[PDB]
Ligand binder design. Structure first.
Ligand SMILES: Nc1ncnc2c1ncn2[C@@H]1O[C@H](COP(=O)(O)OP(=O)(O)O)[C@@H](O)[C@H]1O
Ligand code: ALF
Ligand SMILES: [Mg+2]
Length: 509
RNA sequence: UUUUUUUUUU
């Protein structure tokens, strides 16, 4: 299919809510809802996408725009307009399906639809239901039946669950599907799900297999995503609407990025603690920050340390995929409203989540994928606000920083070294209540996460894996102590003949 | 001794 590039333009005419109303693109009812939100104007991605999405041209749309620049309303506004344009046709049926890679993001998008409803009660007739895992299936279906929604927001697993059973009842008249965080949804482990979803919707569509228009949105995408999305794009033309220059870095330029380089992975823990201590003092506890970590077990560990250090000064919130969904949703609601606090999380929170007025993003170690560096730091400096980010890594993780330069043109100007005092080490370690077995579990989770990104980040296996493993000895305050394991466990890892394995583990069988 | 997410509360 024919890809049509519409690159970034400097001196193009400003599109406004009024201009779109006057032009007949937007109806008064959606104009009213968005005007009442009192935004200074429409963001660049909103100006670029609203009219093309609503065009009668037989095309799909790909849109790229930086983190926090209003991509959500860029698709929600034209979706609502479509519902108004076709309001007397198939009025009890789902016309738009929006898919997101995390449950909390799907639920946030639903909350944004409700904000549109609250600014104009006349839009409540275009109802919305979320279909996400970790919620009661029957309760959600009762809501589908009661509200007969025109908009569904979903995560892939639960959507497939519902579609296998109820595609005929609600989904035979879909006109749009949206992949939010599109590049994430087309990686391995989501791509097959999106192809399943797309196939069902196309097969069940009452008009034709190519009726559905597909919209892809992300801060991180290019021409390669069209290839990955080939099996789910129906139309003969695809419009690529880009608000970022070809060679311009995808990271938001307003973020003051820095990197703090330690000799050892574990030292990044002490560096982050001292950094947070300094920010709390200098800002007089007026501090809202998000700190990312590589694994669930390490995130939980890091939370314990930060509570011991800082619970007297700020709330510390624990956010990852093993937190119950009820608690995930409640903590997201709280951290959205709170003026201060520290959110400690995995990449479950890297993309999409909009927590207003976060001052700083912190990272201990590397993200789960290169693109998530851009999204992680993009949790700050949203909707025209300022922000800073600090990457805490060890020397053996430096090839990640080089890959950011080579692959994404991201060059972090501020770089500094860190070495922990014996005082901070004692302070942090003495409060740790985890047993050795728990510490082993935590460090092993890190070994596995780092092993999976060696190729992508061009790490030296022989250096990074022993360094990560040595965290066990650092945390137990004995640097020659290796991780005690069995022979069969070493065999499962495939390291029973490796010198790398001998450096990491002691066969205490 | 589940590396980040992602149905199985259908
Ligand atoms: N036109 C606008 N002007 C200012 N802020 C906006 C505008 N549109 C949306 N926002 C706000 O910007 C924030 C980030 O939007 P979001 O859609 O989450 O960003 P993205 O999806 O591009 O990362 C939200 O709080 C949203 O309400
Ligand atoms: F691009 Al986003 F939250 F969707 F930063
Ligand atoms: Mg978004």
């Amino acid at each position: 299919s024919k890809l049509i590039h519409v690159p970034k333009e400097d001196n193009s005419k400003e599109v406004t809510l009024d201009s779109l109303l006057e032009e007949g693109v937007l109806d008064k009812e959606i104009h009213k809802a968005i005007t009442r939100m009192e935004f200074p104007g429409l963001t660049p991605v909103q100006q670029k996408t609203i009219k093309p999405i609503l065009s009668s041209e037989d095309h799909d749309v790909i849109a790229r725009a930086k983190t926090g620049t209003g991509k959500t309303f860029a698709f929600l506004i034209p979706i609502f307009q479509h519902l108004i344009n076709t309001k007397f046709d198939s009025q009890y049926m789902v016309k738009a399906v929006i898919v997101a890679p995390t449950r909390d993001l799907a639920l946030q998008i639903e909350a944004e639809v409700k904000k549109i409803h609250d600014m104009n009660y006349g839009l409540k007739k275009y109802a919305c239901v979320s279909l996400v895992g970790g919620t009661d299936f029957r309760a959600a279906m009762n809501k589908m039946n009661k509200l007969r929604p025109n908009i569904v927001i979903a995560t892939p697993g639960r959507l497939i669950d519902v579609l296998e059973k109820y595609s005929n009842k609600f989904f035979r008249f879909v006109d749009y599907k949206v992949l939010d965080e599109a590049d994430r949804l087309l990686e391995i482990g989501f791509r097959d799900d999106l192809e399943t979803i797309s196939g069902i919707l196309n097969e069940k569509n009452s008009k034709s297999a190519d009726n559905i228009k597909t919209l892809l949105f992300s801060a991180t995408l290019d021409d390669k995503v069209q290839k990955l999305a080939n099996n789910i794009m129906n139309k003969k033309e695809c419009l690529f609407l880009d608000t970022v220059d070809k060679n311009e870095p995808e990271a938001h330029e307003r973020i003051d990025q820095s990197v703090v380089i330690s000799e050892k992975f574990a030292n990044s823990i002490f560096a982050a603690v001292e950094h947070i201590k300094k920010q709390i003092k200098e800002r007089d506890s007026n501090y809202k920050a998000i700190i990312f970590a590589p694994t669930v077990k390490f995130t939980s560990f890091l939370c314990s340390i930060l509570k011991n250090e800082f619970k007297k000064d700020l709330p510390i919130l624990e956010f990852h995929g093993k937190i119950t969904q009820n608690k995930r949703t409640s903590l997201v609601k709280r951290f959205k409203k709170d003026e201060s606090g520290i959110l400690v999380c995995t990449d479950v929170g890297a993309r999409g989540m909009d927590f207003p007025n976060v001052h700083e993003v912190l990272q201990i170690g590397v993200p789960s994928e290169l693109a998530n560096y851009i999204h992680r730091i993009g949790r700050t400096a949203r909707s025209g606000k300022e922000g800073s980010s600090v990457l805490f890594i060890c020397k053996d993780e430096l090839p990640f920083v080089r890959e950011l330069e080579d692959a994404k043109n991201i060059v972090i100007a501020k770089q500094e070294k860190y070495e922990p005092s014996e005082e901070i080490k004692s302070e942090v370690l003495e409060a740790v209540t985890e047993e050795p077995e728990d510490i082993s579990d935590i460090v092993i989770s890190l070994i596995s996460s780092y092993r999976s990104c060696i190729k992508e980040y061009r790490f030296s296996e022989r250096r990074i894996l022993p360094e990560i493993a040595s965290t066990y000895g650092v945390l137990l305050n004995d640097p020659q102590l290796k991780i005690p394991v069995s022979r069969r466990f070493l065999d499962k890892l495939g390291l029973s003949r490796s010198p790398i394995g001998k450096a990491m583990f002691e066969i205490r069988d």
